[PDB]
Every structure is written in C-alpha cells, then in structure tokens.
Design a protein around this ligand. Structure first.
Ligand SMILES: Nc1ncnc2c1ncn2[C@@H]1O[C@H](COP(=O)(O)OP(=O)(O)O)[C@@H](O)[C@H]1O
Lengths: 439, 78
C-alpha cells in the first residue's frame, strides 16, 4: 500500500560527484544533509571504517526519517539495516545492556557460501517398507531422466518427506540432497482412472534431460545474532524468532568473534558490515550511553546513524540538561548533521510528489491554498488534507479536487495550531491537573 | 675423465652455458667421441606410431594457514 515513505526511491545523488540534485528520487528540497548522508553512505559501502556515530539533528517534520529511508532504499537487500526504535530496548525479559548488544550484533551480516546437491527427473517407482506399531522404515526410489536410470536408497527422513509430499509414480521432483526438501514440479503422464483420492492434475512437463546429481553453490546471509543464538543453546533453537533468548554469556561471544575471524581468513565467510538506525535516541537514558560509547571500539561494530528532535533537554535517569538530551561525553564521539526547515517553493513540490503518489489529481488554486496551509501547519497536516480532500471529492462525485474540498477538510479536521487554542479556550470542561465541571 | 675434471670446469660452465649457449669446445669433440660409444634411436621413430602428449601447467596459491606456516618456516630460518 501507500505508507508515509513509499514515494522515496533512494537518496538521489550523483555516483561520480555525489552532488545533491534539487529534485531527484522523492527526496526533494534539501541539499546539505543529503550530501552528507551520501558521504556516510559511501563510507558504509566501503566497509572498511568501523565504529562511527552520525546524529541527524533538526526540527521535527523536516525529513530525517526520510533521509534514513533514502539510505535504506539505496543499499538494497544485501547489507543489513536495523530500524531500531529507542524504546524497544527497555525489556523485562533481558537486561537493558544486552538488548543493545543484540541490536549491534544484528547489523553485522555474515555471508557464507555452501554447496548443495540437487536432483532432477521423473520418478518411476516408490518402494516403502514399514513396520507395524512403531519402527524403522526402508526405501528404494527408482528415478529416470532421458539418460540415466538410478535405483537410490532412502532413510527415515526421506520417507517422512515422501509421504508428506505424496510422491506417486510419474512425478517430476527435485530433491536437494543436503537439505532434504521435495518440490514437485509436475507430471509427465495423466491422472489414473482407478483410484478416487488421487488429487489435482498438475502442470504437464516433459522428462528432464541432463544428469541426476547436479551441484549448486548457494549463498546464505545470517546476522551475528543468529549465530549467537544457534551456538548458545543445545536444543532450544527457534528462540531467535520467538524472542525467548534470555541471556548470552560473554564466553559465547568471545568464541564466536574468533571463529568468524577464522572464517574470514579461510575464505569461507565474508563480513558485510551494516547500519544500525536508532530512531529518536533521546529516549535512552544514561545507562545506555555508557555502553553505546564503548561498543563502538571494536572491529565488529556497525556504523550507527541516529535521529533526534529535542533542544536543551534533560537526560533521562539523571538530573541535568544537555543539548539534544545526549551527554557531553557521548557528544564528542558523534558527528552532528543539521537539517533545516523548509521553504514554500519546496513544500509545493513535496506536496506535488505526495499527491502524485497517492493518485490524487489537483487544480492549481487548490494546490496554492494547500501550500498556504502547509506554511502554517507543516507537511503532516497537509498530506492528511490531500487524502481527505480526495475522498470528499469522491463523495460528491467530482473528478479533480478543488478549493471547496480543501476548505471542507480544513473545517472538519483541525491542525494542532487550532487544537491548542481549542484547549486554551474551554479549560473548564477538560481535565487538567485539577478538577473539572459539567456545565 | 680426470681430464674431464678440466671439462668439469666445462661442466660448471655448462650451467653457465645453460644460461649462455654460445660455446663450441667439446661438442664437436663429442661428435668425434659419440660416433662410437652410443647409438641413438629417436622418439620420432616411435612416436609416429603414437599420438601426442601435452603438459598443462596450472598454478596455485597458499592459504592463510598454509602461508602462515610457510612464513613460520621463514621465521624458523630467521
Ligand atoms: N525532503 C523530503 N522529501 C520527500 N519527503 C519528505 C521530505 N521531507 C519530509 N518529507 C515527508 O514528510 C514526512 C515527515 O518526514 P519525517 O522524516 O517523518 O519527519 P520527522 O523527521 O520529523 O519524523 C515524511 O512522511 C516524508 O514523506
């Protein structure tokens, strides 16, 4: 569907000069922060430099998460990109520091390569021997391509997969020999006229040619957190999905770091360093910063990019204030990129992009009035007015939206600048910090 | 053959003429010598029955552990 960051298709800079284009790939209307984020993106794609800190500071509704999603769309589905929010760390299951350690180790991909052995061909006969009331199974599978005619054997798991798949005579199946999955591709004969509970006639494929035992080289990318969970527990796997991981001791991490270094040297694995994005870091207390400053000290730390909103705020868990709510022993390590509020000739084209994304057609008078509203209430009210005016124009059966639809939507739904006045007018029929009356 | 000790000086410059094949002191003298004492039937007389044989040279590398032990041996000669 159409979320609030679906129009963005990357960061929109040059590849040779990385100059900020004034209108390219959604992120339209800002030049300094997009150029600096392009530099950060290039030193992430280099992968050499480890353990930095980028702080995208600025007023709200200025496109900070938009720049973050622009870097996310620009890396593709290769490099990990954790979209961590700062309130998720405060768990009750695990400690507050170990949640940060997992959040760092989720953003270091390990890309390994392994050889599987796939089969191909037409099943000629199945032969299954079963015991009575519990016991082992025996299996002989005769399979034929256009060239070879093999009679393979089977174990218990292969028969448990065959009966799960219901592989009859005359099926084009492909068995991965290593993993042990069975995917029926279709049939070569037709459906028999002797049995009732047979099934559905599948796709008509011919007999495959070539060889039986073919080899394949697959590439598997796991984060370090998955390696930590599968090597921290004897049988309790799958806890890396259902979040049941209590604590991983340090003896496990100091062995997995060494084994990943050995896999890096052997040419088995490759370490792909990633991005940890922390949205609204001002909610973390000082007990988190006293670990974040020291986890950025090793070869396995991701390049942290994080946002903020606040001016001189007080740090949680303390008694004193600081710029951005972050301590001044942590603000030495970071590098702060500022963002600026917008200009109306940029708000016009941003609302034009948001209107063309949600498939809404406009008139220039309505767009001028909409820009006039967006000057005084931000983009977050104007985009909602776009969608609302689209549906009100759909209610009265109009092709394009007009001035009257925007005025209707402005009359119905208040911007916060009028809701503050609505609070400040009737203070006697709203619960403040005190009592309230009823007429 | 102890006159061929002076030709053993020739034999060490036989390495030097494996570098530098531009000498003729013993070869024509060996043509005098090897008209007796030897009788050569060649591969060309016999490989004309056969087909062909071709050497293919394939290079390799050293792994990290392998190069690490090799320069551990170079530290051992150090
Ligand atoms: N430069 C921009 N280009 C494209 N869209 C933008 C830009 N700036 C803001 N927006 C839009 O405005 C909205 C607010 O941006 P966002 O990053 O969520 O603000 P904040 O940083 O305050 O959370 C986003 O939905 C985004 O689509």
């Amino acid at each position: 569907l159409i979320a609030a960051h679906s129009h963005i298709r990357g960061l929109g800079v040059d590849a040779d000069t990385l100059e900020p284009r004034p209108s390219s790939q959604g992120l339209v209307g800002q030049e300094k922060a997009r150029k600096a984020a392009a530099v950060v993106l290039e030193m992430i794609k280099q992968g050499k430099i480890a353990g930095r800190a980028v702080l995208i500071a600025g007023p709200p509704s200025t496109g900070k998460t938009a720049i973050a999603m622009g870097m996310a769309q620009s890396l593709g589905q290769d490099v990990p990109f954790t979209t961590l929010a700062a309130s998720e760390i405060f768990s009750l299951e695990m400690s507050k520091t170990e949640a940060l350690t997992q959040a760092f180790r989720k953003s270091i991909g390990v890309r390994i390569k392994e050889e599987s052995e796939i089969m191909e061909g037409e099943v000629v006969e199945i032969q299954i021997d079963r015991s009575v009331t519990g016991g082992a199974k025996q299996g002989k599978l005769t399979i034929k391509t256009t060239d070879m005619e093999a009679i393979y054997d089977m174990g218990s798991k292969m028969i448990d997969a065959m009966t799960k798949e219901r592989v009859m005579a005359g099926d084009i199946i492909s068995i991965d020999k290593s993993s042990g999955k069975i995917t029926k591709l279709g049939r070569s004969y037709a459906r028999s006229r002797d049995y009732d509970a047979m099934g559905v006639d599948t796709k008509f494929l011919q007999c495959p040619e070539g060889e039986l035992q073919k080899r394949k080289e697959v590439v598997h990318t796991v984060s370090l957190h998955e390696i930590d969970v599968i090597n921290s527990r004897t049988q309790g796997f799958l806890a890396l999905f259902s979040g049941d991981t209590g604590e991983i001791r340090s003896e496990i991490r100091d062995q997995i770091n060494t084994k990943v270094a050995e896999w890096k040297e052997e040419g088995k694995a490759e370490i792909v360093p990633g991005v940890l994005f922390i949205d609204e870091v001002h909610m973390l207390d000082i007990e988190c910063f006293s670990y974040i400053n020291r986890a950025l000290e090793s070869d396995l730390a991701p390049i942290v990019i994080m946002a903020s909103n606040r001016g001189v705020s007080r740090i949680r868990g303390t008694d004193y204030k600081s710029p951005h709510g972050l301590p001044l022993d942590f603000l030495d390590r970071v590098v702060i990129i500022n963002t600026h509020p917008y200009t109306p000739d940029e708000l016009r084209q941003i609302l034009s992009i948001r209107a063309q994304e949600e498939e809404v057609d406009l008139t220039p008078d309505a767009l001028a009035l909409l820009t006039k509203i967006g000057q005084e209430a931000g983009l977050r009210y104007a985009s909602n007015l776009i969608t609302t005016s689209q549906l009100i124009a759909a209610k009265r059966r109009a092709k394009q939206v007009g001035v009257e639809d925007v005025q209707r939507s402005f009359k119905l739904f208040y911007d916060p600048a009028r809701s503050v006045r609505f609070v400040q007018e009737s203070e006697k029929r709203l619960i403040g910090n005190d009592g309230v009356v009823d007429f | 053959h102890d006159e061929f000790s002076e030709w053993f000086s020739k034999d060490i410059e036989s390495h030097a003429q494996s570098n530098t094949k531009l000498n003729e002191d013993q070869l024509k003298r060996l043509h005098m010598i090897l008209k007796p004492f030897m009788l050569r039937r060649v591969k060309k007389h016999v490989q004309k029955e056969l087909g062909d044989k071709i050497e293919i040279d394939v290079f390799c590398e050293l792994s990290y552990r392998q190069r690490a032990m090799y320069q551990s041996l170079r530290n051992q000669i150090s």
